[PDB]
Design a protein around this ligand. Structure first.
Ligand SMILES: CC(C)(C)c1csc(NC(=O)c2ccn3c(=O)c(/C=C/c4nnn[nH]4)c(N4CCC[C@@H](OC(=O)NCC[N+](C)(C)CC(=O)[O-])C4)nc3c2)n1
Ligand SMILES: CCCCCCCCCCCCO[C@@H]1O[C@H](CO)[C@@H](O[C@H]2O[C@H](CO)[C@@H](O)[C@H](O)[C@H]2O)[C@H](O)[C@H]1O
Ligand SMILES: CCCCCCCCCCCCO[C@@H]1O[C@H](CO)[C@@H](O[C@H]2O[C@H](CO)[C@@H](O)[C@H](O)[C@H]2O)[C@H](O)[C@H]1O
Ligand SMILES: CCCCCCCCCCCCO[C@@H]1O[C@H](CO)[C@@H](O[C@H]2O[C@H](CO)[C@@H](O)[C@H](O)[C@H]2O)[C@H](O)[C@H]1O
Lengths: 1030, 200, 100, 50, 50, 50
């Protein structure tokens, strides 16, 4: 090629056009969204078993569902959660890359098989199966600002009015509502009910016989008798709708002339299905929605569209209802795109400038201007092909690639320009001449660079998914670049470039350029003299290399090594845990003081506060609420005392005071989707059936033994504390003595105290649920237990205290199980300075001290990093061997390839330095850039050596070749490295919105860039002469 | 449908939901059945067992499992008056007639409500009047449909949609196929003129 | 149940769930006075029939708890939806020994 | 260009497919016999006259 | 898919099976016809029975 | 999946009562290891022989 396309500029141009086109069509219809699916996909099975112990929900629904939940493809592990409010969750975690639609359907199939094994009330409730990934698009609040509506009223609104339209909005995936539909609430008074010798169970039965659908037949149904003529359906009665219809319904008819109905005995009105979770946006009571993006949608379009839909409904809303949008991914997925077309612009601009500055031509200036965008276009096409998307990482992927993309354009032009000046060949001549020298190398370097980036795409787990994003977007960019810098560029060169006088390096020029050329020219000679001196005096340097190498080896183990960069998304979390036995109303108070403060004392940074009671990241329960703090946009809170990490630093202090409610306060970890990216994560498991008590003390020994270990820090239980519960105790003897029914005993507790889902009732079309339970003042203290009367043999009401006998005993409000056997989740991290594998190696040991029958499993990120980590060395070796082999075949030598590979440290040292200096971590963004810098460094090196080789061959000294090759190479090296480090600086200084990551790459590259330029120029000729000599 | 038997281009226009139908609105005063003896709407075990079928259980029959079915005599569910004939047994043991709690208020609603894209709907069909094409017919319909009480739109479905869609591609089909041809000639002939000579 | 009861207690719920499935072209349900209903979810021309079926089934399972207990303890049918019949294969009686 | 816009626009050509449908719908309420008679006339004024 | 389709029609059967069977726990499985292996457990000093 | 069960009972063994050993009565996998090993071997021979 090249030669072939040098003569066929139009064909060449066509190939451009088609890839340009493919780019475009693609570019405009790629899904756009913030992150791909990093997390290992998970399905969640969940019901509530209205007012039931953790114990019952664990041994009655979890243990049974779990026993059936096997023979499911791609399953990695499974964990459960049985809670005090009576809710449960089985979380089934499958392998990355698992079709989430098959994952889900296999799970709800095993679920379906296990249903008739569950208790009635649970079945009637209906068990929900869904995809548990937390990649939320926006969460929208619906709030009652005059505090007229209760939460329950709002969420019923949401279900009835907002749900179905929002459902039909373009690009809306799965969403969750903060609460549900209304239910016909009914509130049994124990006294009012006792005075007519009536049981709560009587009421249930009454409603069941009195709130039904009359099934209805057909007038003139087939078979009919001869005649018939009129065939019409007969419609009977539907069901009760009004609260009144309910207050009616006859319960007893009295000995005299009268009749008793539900309205005498209980209160009745529409209400909550469940009262466990209460939540409010800035004090004001509120529900809301958490929306997911549908698969392939556009995060930008559909956010705009969700809004549209809601706006079209804001005209119709009851007075004092506001729909505020607290959290929204749009600012960031926008920020990321501007911050790319901006640096792709500044880059093509910057290239143009240094193009001119060195090559005084104007036509030359725009060969790179055509080629770079022809490539970026294509790249979005290849991305399309491989089935990726436009997201945070595929975007940085492009920025990071621009180095490689730009260098490829510069080398090709500067070389024709050079050959033309030094040899006086016509542009067309210089082009083929030039490609003669370059094709070879180029093709080869594409191989080299594929080996540098691909093995990273073979990692597994979340870590791997992230690398694949970079690796593929990059080697795609580079592969395309090579192609167009083989087909288009030389063609453009031969066409658009203008002949230049042999010998004319232009210092006669005068003016500024005359100043420059004379100047640069002198520098070049200096550089030559530099090299020439080094090649004279070898050993000294070779050893100063060996120092710089050690410096790098030392600089590694000394950098803090984290998974991701710390990010300021617009968000902050606050956890509240009021001590065991607190009431939500007593927890609510903490979460309110919390909000007042943030909103008042802190509003320099804080924009809105959403506050939940009876739910947490430690579990659900009346002692548990928390706060999702929404910050105002980064522009509106400059200065590093208004960063999340700062606001959160001081909200610790502000709340440290409380001697009545532990209150953690922390930032979310950058990729929400992945929960908790730090330290380590494990479950302790009761294998040999040893029991909750032993297990509980294995947890506690483990903990107060890690606390006193060098290698670990911050080691907690994720779960919940054990607490007092009320061990109500029946007596079979003295209860059949009063001749009381015993099925009647505990059927009354279930209903009065636990509540009971009795029935359906069409409310405004929608069928909704009818719940029966004791009025609240009737069920708050042991003494209220006595308020309750059951029927015996004769019509005599027997009080509960008659055969009852309460007792404080303590159990658990959160029963955890991991892989079928009961568990306790521990979290922690390694002692500052130390690493994850160290901490596991510690934990590995302190686990051995545990009671027999208790074992353990690693889970979440700790599970993954055990696997991905065992595979690194294999990849690094393959990467190293393969590049080696490519260099061998290019250099027709087993030894020269070393003179290129030894540049690597020279790259990395600077990288490490800058990163460590600016106080940053050894993370994924640093890792990937480090591969960019060493990659672009190998390129430089490859061309120098290749030239030195071509010359040495065309007949001249090893040392004379090395020097003649540098010099020849110096100018494009300087050009492309000046172009880039300038193009990257913004990321280095980047400010707000993704800026944390931009710092991670800006700092890294340009550490390596600076050193790899100012050093390979000297040491590459050393190494080449060095190994050649040898 | 009026305007459609009138319009000269259409031919055979029809609906798909079969109108409204007479439905026998039943009625009970819960209080009166409680006054007699039959308390609680237990009455269903009579209304639906007699006037609808009632799959009770299974019997094998020549080695194959069919259903056992309960339903009233044909002559006992033919007229509003046949409901008179049905005596609910009592809590004492006596036959309360069905006239103690009746009220057949011969009413009427819909036999088949259709629905399309989350709004309610009616589906009309119809061909085009001979010598004309579905496009003509289609264009015609988009007129007769303006005279529709605002707040009532329409949607094409089926063949119509498939045709609406077929027609919209065409522009681009031609553009693209034109363009490819151009470039391939360019490539193959190393000319711009030659391509232009052929587009012309 | 009444056509309108049926339209409002089932069709309404499940239909809203199907909103949002991938490559969805349109939905068209119908409810009858005889109890029966039918939602027909049409997809775009390249959608794999079996993933579409599964996706339907996945959403369907979510609607379930908001359905009448007669409906719910009953079992909802889901199936691929051909418009046309390939052939009617019939049987008739040479003499007259077998009734309809 | 003038000639284009002047041509009518179909989808698929009509085809003597070799089969046809009759579709009967007696007014909202009729008995089995009502429909059945209608259905039995058109089955004659077709199998006998066409 | 085979399994998704079978269970799906198995589904429409379930409401008509006897409680005693439903409660018993039905297994829909996609295995290969033959036994791969038997994992055995055996008592060493006889403390454990069959 | 042989390897993987070998692996599950592998780290369940440390929890079994003192009077109990896991054993592999029936097993099919020995034949495939054996089979492909035997071929490997007659390949290595063929190559020395050739
Ligand atoms: C972290 C992120 C994504 C950046 C963010 C920032 S702000 C925000 N959203 C919230 O701040 C917020 C604010 C209020 N919430 C709530 O009030 C509830 C409580 C909801 C509730 N109340 N009664 N029932 N449910 C809730 N769930 C706390 C409970 C566990 C989670 O799952 C769901 O609640 N899913 C909804 C499905 N329901 C409950 C409807 C199932 C059903 O049909 O019964 C979320 N989550 C929230 C979440 N998320
Ligand atoms: C499964 C397939 C995997 C393939 C992986 C192999 C990667 C190969 C990398 C591309 C190398 C091409 O290398 C090609 O051949 C020889 C090197 O031997 C070189 O040709 C050379 O010959 C002469 C004299 O020998 C020199 O003046 C000069 O160095 C160069 O012109 C060119 O630099 C190049 O055209
Ligand atoms: C011209 C283009 C050339 C560039 C392309 C080069 C691609 C790089 C190849 C690496 C891909 C191979 O995939 C990788 O294989 C190795 C070796 O079996 C695996 O490694 C596995 O076996 C080795 C050897 O027993 C173990 O030390 C290792 O811990 C284990 O995981 C990796 O887990 C897998 O990810
Ligand atoms: C024109 C430009 C072309 C550029 C495009 C190049 C595409 C190359 C992408 C290769 C994708 C590799 O796919 C990835 O393989 C790795 C490693 O084997 C898998 O990881 C898995 O493999 C090995 C098995 O030996 C295990 O050690 C590891 O724990 C496991 O999870 C990933 O789950 C899979 O997704």
């Amino acid at each position: 090629m090249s030669k072939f396309f040098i003569d066929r500029p139009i064909f060449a141009w066509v190939i451009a056009l088609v890839i340009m086109l493919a780019g475009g069509l693609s570019i405009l219809s790629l899904p756009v969204n913030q992150y791909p699916a990093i997390a290992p996909p998970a399905i969640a099975v969940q019901v509530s078993y209205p007012g039931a112990s953790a114990e019952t929900v664990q041994d009655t629904v979890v243990q049974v569902i779990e026993q059936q939940m096997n023979g499911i493809d791609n399953l990695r592990y499974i964990s459960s959660e049985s809670n005090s409010d009576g809710s449960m969750t089985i979380t089934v975690t499958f392998e990355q890359g698992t079709d989430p639609d098959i994952a889900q359907v296999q799970v709800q199939n095993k679920l379906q098989l296990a249903t008739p094994l569950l208790p009635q009330e649970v079945q009637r409730q209906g068990i929900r199966v869904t995809k548990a990934v937390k990649n939320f698009l926006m969460v929208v609040g619906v709030v009652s600002t005059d505090g007229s509506m209760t939460k329950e009223d709002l969420s019923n609104y949401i279900v009835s009015n907002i749900q179905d339209p929002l459902s039909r909005t373009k690009g809306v995936g799965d969403f969750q509502v903060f609460g549900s539909q209304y239910s016909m609430r009914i509130w049994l008074d124990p006294a009012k009910l006792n005075s007519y010798q009536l049981t709560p169970g009587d009421v249930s039965s009454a409603i069941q016989a009195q709130n039904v659908q009359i099934s209805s037949g057909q007038l003139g149904g087939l078979p009919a008798v001869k005649g018939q003529q009129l065939n019409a359906t007969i419609i009977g009665k539907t069901r009760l709708q009004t609260a009144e219809q309910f207050e009616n319904i006859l319960l007893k008819v009295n000995p005299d002339g009268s009749q008793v109905r539900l309205k005498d005995v209980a209160d009745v009105g529409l209400g909550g299905q469940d009262y466990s979770i209460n939540a409010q946006f800035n004090g004001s009571p509120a529900s809301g929605i958490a929306i997911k993006l549908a698969t392939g949608a556009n995060a930008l379009d559909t956010a705009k569209a969700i809004r549209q839909t809601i706006a079209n409904l804001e005209p119709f809303m009851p007075q004092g209802m506001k729909v505020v949008y607290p959290y929204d991914t749009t600012p960031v997925v926008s920020a990321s795109i501007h911050e790319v077309v901006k640096t792709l612009g500044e880059a093509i601009l910057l290239v143009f400038l240094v193009m001119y500055l060195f090559l005084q031509n104007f036509r030359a200036t725009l060969i790179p201007t055509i080629a770079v965008p022809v490539v970026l276009l294509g790249t979005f096409g290849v991305l399309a092909a491989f089935g990726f998307s436009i997201n945070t990482l595929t975007m940085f992927g492009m920025v990071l690639a621009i180095g490689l993309l730009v260098d490829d354009a510069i080398v090709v032009v500067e070389n024709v320009e050079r050959v033309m000046a030094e040899e006086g060949l016509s542009p067309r001549e210089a082009a083929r001449k030039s490609m003669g020298q370059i094709q070879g190398a180029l093709v080869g370097i594409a191989m080299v660079l594929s080996a540098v980036f691909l093995p990273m795409a073979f990692f597994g787990g979340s870590t791997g998914v992230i690398y694949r994003q970079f690796s593929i977007t990059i080697v795609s960019a580079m592969a395309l670049s090579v192609i167009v810098a083989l087909i288009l560029t030389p063609a453009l060169c031969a066409t658009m470039l203008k002949p230049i006088e042999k010998g004319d390096h232009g210092e006669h020029k005068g003016g500024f350029f005359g100043w420059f050329n004379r100047m640069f020219l002198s520098t070049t000679h200096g550089y030559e003299r530099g090299v020439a001196s080094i090649l004279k005096h070898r050993a000294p340097y070779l050893l100063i290399y060996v120092v710089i190498v050690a410096g790098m080896i030392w600089m590694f183990t000394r950098i803090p090594t984290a998974f991701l960069p710390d990010e300021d998304q617009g968000v902050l979390f606050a956890q509240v845990q009021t001590p065991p036995g607190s009431s939500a109303e007593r927890t609510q108070v903490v979460v309110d003081s919390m909000r007042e403060y943030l909103l008042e004392k802190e509003s320099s940074s804080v924009s809105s506060v959403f506050t939940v009671t009876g739910f947490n990241f430690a579990g659900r329960g009346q002692s548990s609420g928390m706060a999702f703090i929404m910050l105002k946009p980064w522009e509106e809170r400059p200065g590093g005392e208004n960063s999340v990490f700062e606001l959160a630093k001081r909200a610790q202090m502000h709340f440290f005071s409380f001697k009545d409610a532990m209150v953690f306060a922390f930032a979310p970890p950058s990729v929400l989707e992945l929960g908790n990216a730090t330290g380590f994560d494990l479950f302790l498991q009761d294998q040999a059936g040893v029991g909750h008590e032993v297990l509980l003390q294995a947890r506690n020994k483990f903990l107060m033994l890690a606390a006193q270990n060098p290698a670990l820090q911050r080691v907690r239980p994720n779960g919940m504390s054990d607490e007092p519960q009320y061990k109500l105790e029946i007596d079979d003897e003295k209860a059949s003595a009063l001749g009381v029914s015993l099925a009647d005993i505990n059927s009354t507790v279930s209903i009065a105290w636990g509540s009971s889902y009795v029935n359906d009732f069409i409310d405004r079309g929608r069928v909704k649920r009818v719940y029966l339970q004791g009025r609240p003042d009737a069920r708050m203290n042991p003494d209220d237990l006595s308020k309750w009367y059951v029927r015996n043999d004769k019509g005599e009401m027997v009080p509960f205290n008659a055969f009852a006998t309460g007792k404080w005993e303590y159990g658990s409000p959160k029963l955890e199980r991991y892989n079928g056997v009961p568990a306790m989740e521990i979290l922690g991290e390694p002692a500052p300075g130390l690493s994850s594998g160290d901490a596991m190696a510690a934990v590995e040991e302190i686990v051995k001290q545990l009671p027999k029958g208790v074992g353990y499993s690693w889970t979440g990120l700790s599970y993954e990093e055990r696997l991905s980590g065992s595979q690194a060395p294999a990849l690094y070796a393959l990467s190293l061997l393969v590049v080696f082999l490519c260099l061998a075949a290019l250099y027709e030598s087993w030894s020269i390839p070393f003179s290129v590979m030894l540049v690597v440290p020279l790259g990395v040292i600077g990288a490490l330095l800058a990163t460590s200096m600016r106080g940053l971590s050894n993370d994924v963004f640093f890792q990937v850039g480090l591969l960019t810098t060493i990659g672009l460094s190998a390129k430089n090196a490859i061309l120098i050596v290749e030239f030195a080789k071509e010359l040495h061959e065309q007949g001249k000294g090893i040392v004379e070749a090395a020097i003649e090759a540098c010099r020849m190479r110096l100018r494009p090296i300087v050009m492309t490295s000046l172009a880039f480090i300038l193009g990257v600086v913004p990321l280095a200084i980047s400010t707000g919105a993704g800026s944390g990551s931009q710092h991670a790459i800006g700092t890294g590259v340009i550490g390596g860039m600076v050193t790899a330029t100012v050093l390979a120029i000297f040491w590459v000729p050393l190494f080449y002469v060095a190994v050649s000599t040898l």
